[PDB]
Amino acid sequence: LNNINFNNISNNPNLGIEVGREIQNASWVKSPFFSITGTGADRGV
């Protein structure tokens, strides 16, 4: 009895973790190729 808890506010109830309805994706890169490509006769692709 009454030993050191070592517990955190994590495993303390009354808190009630809330989770973000919004997801943010791990995609940001944009390769240049869409600028190269085109219907023109002189485009690189």
């Binding site: 009454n2 030993n3 050191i4 808890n5 070592f6 517990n7």
Partner: protein, 124 residues
């Protein structure tokens, strides 16, 4: 690291005059954390013992925890105590006559340092 600790502490000091009898020195609450009991003899006794112990508020539940003969004139209980219905610290002197070798009456002083049952929560 988190715990509950006793944050309130009291010291009770009481004198009696070292001759045969029973004295109710210190009153303790239920759940008190008795952490020091010290008995001191002021003067030069010639014969007798002092026994301090615990007893009930009413009924005859006396049991010595520290016995002091004449010679050493000072003592401290070697043990720590949580008060469980034995809410009187008491001292009895079974053998004693007049002061002896001094002409001035012999005193006994008991100091009880105890922590109150209340607890608070602290993390370090």
């Amino acid at each position: 690291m988190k715990q509950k600790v006793h944050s309130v502490s009291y010291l009770a000091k009481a004198e009696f005059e070292y001759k045969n009898g029973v004295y109710d020195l210190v009153a303790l609450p239920t759940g008190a954390e008795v952490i020091k009991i010290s008995l001191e003899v002021v003067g030069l006794p010639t014969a007798g013992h002092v026994s301090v112990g615990f007893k009930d508020e009413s009924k005859k539940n006396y049991s010595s925890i520290l016995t002091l003969p004449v010679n050493e004139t000072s003592g401290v209980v070697t043990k720590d105590y949580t008060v469980k219905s034995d809410k009187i610290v008491a001292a009895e002197v079974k053998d004693a006559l007049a002061e002896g070798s001094d002409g001035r009456p012999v005193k006994c002083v008991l100091r009880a340092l105890y922590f109150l049952p209340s607890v608070i929560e602290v993390e370090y």
